[PDB]
Design a protein around this ligand. Structure first.
Ligand SMILES: NC(=O)C1=CN([C@@H]2O[C@H](COP(=O)(O)OP(=O)(O)OC[C@H]3O[C@@H](n4cnc5c(N)ncnc54)[C@H](O)[C@@H]3O)[C@@H](O)[C@H]2O)C=CC1
Ligand SMILES: Cc1cc2nc3c(=O)[nH]c(=O)nc-3n(C[C@H](O)[C@H](O)[C@H](O)COP(=O)(O)O)c2cc1C
Ligand code: SF4
Ligand code: FES
Lengths: 213, 85, 430
């Protein structure tokens, strides 16, 4: 992962890339979201949309974004290199991400990472030869009470075990999609031993409103 | 800016030639490397006039106070918006 | 009142916190949301700010700044520039997952709080900044915003009050530094997540140079309930200057990791033993607790017994409440490896603008890897303390303090363990 670009035959300014017309309409909605005189504020969502169209960011989406939004291409390069969610290298179809921060390392995410590594036959930062998986290691993903967890594309898979995540990878290899949620008895974030709080029904409107309102 | 505090008196640069043996810079000026430091302009002028040297005085150039503000980098309707920070 | 804890289910603001009821508009109006909003928007911005000030609410982002005064900083006549509320839902701090649940299960409370907060300071619109990885949560929030738009609750002639207010949702691109307010303001504008300096404060120059107020999701989603139930009701919980309820995320080496609403001055031991099901291996197996996520220094087992979970009871215990995220490590935790992992996390998520963090966080990462391996002499413990003192207070933003604090806490509470590990390596190697 280098922060300088060399013009490969697969990644050059002459690489064909353009937005589909519905993506052009979405881009114009994104631009219309922001005030006039600040059309440069739409660099992030248009670039994200270009990635979701293409799967990765060559140096043809960045200059296309710079031409569409009327900004210097150096600013688009800065934005692409600053943020970790922009893939400047072609990743596989399924971008597996394993969070190994302390709230997840305490609940043994290393076992999950080792199980994935010895299931797919690759290491961290490596892709499968048939371009179907990509395993990288990330920071905290905002589901620390559901630790350990992985994220595959837009789907959060939480409360995982090595056998369960091996079955998840097997489901993805067959073309199926799994259910993006916790895999234990809990549903979203409640304790596994039942609800300690909020067992009463909500009181509905008009309850406890102060006088004079 | 600590080197721009004192006035200096120097002399004009005369001929320097190459040495036939070793290529060093030979000169015939005794006053080639001689400079003098004065606290004010008037003392330098008095010292130059005392020794009978014709002098040229060039005035001290000091930078004008600018108007620097951090909030101008993020103006709402001005051209002084920074492209990146 | 002196004894705190055990909040009743009638007093909890976030009903449907666990997602067991309907999160859409029909489910929102069956619980109390969007009630008498026309009267709230008509009674006045000064009245709303006074109700917030009387509640004693402090900022739930982690700073603990009083939200009434911070929202009253924007009560000034406009000089022609628009005014903006920006709700921050980045939530990149480890141990914290409350705002994700608030977005996923209660988006209508958030957008009602957005409308009330926009009326409170005369804001023109709302730019809800959400994390890049929270795709489904952002989609649920957009669905709820569309449902509120189609019913006329927000938008043109909001709730039949004559007030003009839009809500916009933007998405990040995976940067923890974008959680900072000025860094978020720079990230919305199409730049990098490099924080600005103060002054200028966001109330004077914010997004696009306009006046802007950055507020947390948890300090926004309670404003309609504060304005409806009453400020004194919200101030009747907790100690003085710690009024109100709070979402706590208990994670780590516990029996049941969970997110639970509770009173502000609940003891940590009572919270763990009542809502988390206890420490894995019992309370005697406890080694350390991080009270407020990775930015706050840890506390050991002996301190952790009789400390209330509010701002002052942790400030006097040389730590902070932070995001109110309790990480529990029992005696089977290599605590040096955990703190080294935290320093590595702060190394990765640093914008690199100002040089003390940019150099010294990598410096502490290197010396902490060497400390975990034990390849050191006892003098660089005090050298690392000096380095952490050199970073804390000399940076643009507060990530430098957030990376210096765990190192200082680990040194102060566990220097004998570092010394014995290092001398064991020195004995076994030579
Ligand atoms: N919630 C989270 O995910 C995280 C929270 N934190 C916590 O955040 C805190 C540090 O954040 P900061 O924003 O730097 O805290 P604090 O210094 O800035 O101030 C909080 C808010 O009050 C405003 N403010 C303060 N004094 C002001 C004044 N005189 N005039 C006008 N406005 C004023 C600031 O602009 C800001 O919006 C720490 O307590 C840290 O533990 C840290 C990392 C992550
Ligand atoms: C590096 C860094 C990251 C932060 N991330 C968040 C965050 O994700 N969510 C949050 O509410 N505050 C975060 N903050 C704190 C904010 O600067 C600010 O205090 C908060 O957004 C608003 O506080 P309030 O609750 O009083 O409105 C972060 C601060 C720093 C220095
Ligand atoms: S402390 Fe670090 S993250 Fe914060 S402004 Fe400085 S370089 Fe950026
Ligand atoms: S530490 Fe892994 S999701 Fe937060």
């Amino acid at each position: 992962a280098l922060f300088v670009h060399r013009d490969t035959p697969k990644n050059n300014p002459e690489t064909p890339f353009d937005f589909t017309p519905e993506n052009y309409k979405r881009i114009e909605a994104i631009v219309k979201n922001y005030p006039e005189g600040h059309k440069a504020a739409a660099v992030l969502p248009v670039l994200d949309l270009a990635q979701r169209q293409n799967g990765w960011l060559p140096i043809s989406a960045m200059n296309k974004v710079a031409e569409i939004l009327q900004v210097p291409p150096m600013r688009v390069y800065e934005v692409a290199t600053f943020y970790t969610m922009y893939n400047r290298k072609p990743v596989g179809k399924y971008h597996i991400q394993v969070c190994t921060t302390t709230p997840c390392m305490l609940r043994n995410s290393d076992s999950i990472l080792e199980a994935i590594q010895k299931k797919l036959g690759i290491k961290v930062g490596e892709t499968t030869p048939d371009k179907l998986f990509t395993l990288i290691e990330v920071e905290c993903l905002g589901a620390c009470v559901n630790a350990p967890m992985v994220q595959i594309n837009d789907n959060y898979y939480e409360d995982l075990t090595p056998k369960d995540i091996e079955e998840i990878i097997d489901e993805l290899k067959a073309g199926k999609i799994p259910k993006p949620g916790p895999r234990s008895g809990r549903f979203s974030c409640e304790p596994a031993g039942g609800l300690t709080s909020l067992t009463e029904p909500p009181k509905g409107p008009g309850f406890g409103v102060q006088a004079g309102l | 800016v600590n080197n721009t505090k004192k006035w200096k008196m120097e002399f004009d640069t005369r001929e320097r030639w190459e040495n036939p043996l070793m290529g060093w810079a030979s000169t015939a000026d005794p006053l080639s490397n001689l400079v003098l430091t004065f606290s004010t302009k008037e003392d330098a002028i008095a010292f130059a006039e005392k020794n009978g040297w014709s002098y040229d005085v060039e005035e001290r150039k000091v930078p004008k106070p600018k108007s620097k503000s951090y909030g101008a980098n993020f103006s709402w309707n001005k051209r002084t918006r920074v492209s990146t920070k | 009142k002196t004894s705190f804890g055990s909040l009743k289910d009638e007093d909890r603001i976030f009903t449907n916190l666990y997602g067991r009821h309907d999160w859409r508009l029909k489910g929102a109006q069956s619980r109390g949301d969007w009630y008498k909003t026309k009267e709230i928007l008509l009674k006045g911005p000064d009245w709303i700010l006074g109700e917030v000030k009387t509640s004693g609410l402090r900022g739930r982002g982690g700073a603990g700044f009083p939200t009434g005064l911070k929202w009253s900083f924007m009560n000034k006549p406009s000089d022609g520039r628009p005014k903006y509320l920006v709700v921050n839902a980045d939530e990149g701090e480890p141990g914290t997952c409350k705002d994700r649940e608030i977005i996923r299960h209660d988006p209508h409370k958030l957008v009602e709080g957005c409308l009330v907060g926009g009326r409170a300071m005369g804001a023109r619109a709302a730019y809800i900044y959400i994390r890049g990885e929270f795709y489904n949560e952002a989609s649920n929030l957009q669905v709820a915003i569309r449902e509120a738009y189609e019913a006329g609750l927000i938008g043109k002639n909001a709730c039949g009050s004559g007030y003009d207010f839009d809500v916009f949702v933007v998405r990040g691109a995976g940067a923890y530094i974008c959680g900072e307010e000025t860094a978020l303001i720079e990230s919305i504008e199409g730049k990098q997540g490099k924080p600005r300096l103060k002054p200028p404060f966001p109330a004077d120059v914010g997004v696009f140079g306009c006046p802007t107020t950055v507020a947390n999701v948890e300090t926004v989603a309670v404003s309609p309930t504060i304005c409806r139930r009453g400020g004194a009701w919200f101030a009747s919980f907790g100690r003085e200057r710690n009024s109100g309820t709070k979402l706590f995320n208990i994670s780590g080496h516990v029996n049941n990791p969970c997110t639970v609403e509770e009173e502000m001055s609940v003891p940590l031991k009572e919270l763990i033993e009542k809502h988390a099901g206890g420490v894995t291996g019992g309370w005697d197996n406890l080694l350390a607790v991080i009270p407020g996520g990775s930015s706050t220094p840890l506390i050991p087992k002996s301190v952790c017994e009789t400390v209330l979970m509010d701002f002052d009871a942790l400030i006097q215990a040389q730590t902070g409440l932070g995001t109110a995220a309790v990480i529990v490590m029992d005696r089977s935790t290599d605590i040096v490896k955990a703190i080294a992992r935290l320093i590595e996390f702060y190394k990765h998520e640093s914008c690199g603008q100002c040089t003390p963090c940019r150099e010294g966080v990598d410096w502490m990462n290197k010396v902490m890897a060497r400390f975990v391996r034990g390849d050191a002499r006892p003098a660089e413990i005090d050298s690392l303390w000096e380095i952490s003192k050199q970073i804390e207070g000399h940076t643009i933003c507060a990530l430098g303090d957030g990376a210096a604090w765990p190192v200082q806490g680990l040194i102060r509470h566990f220097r004998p363990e570092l010394e014995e590990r290092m001398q064991r390596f020195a004995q076994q190697h030579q």
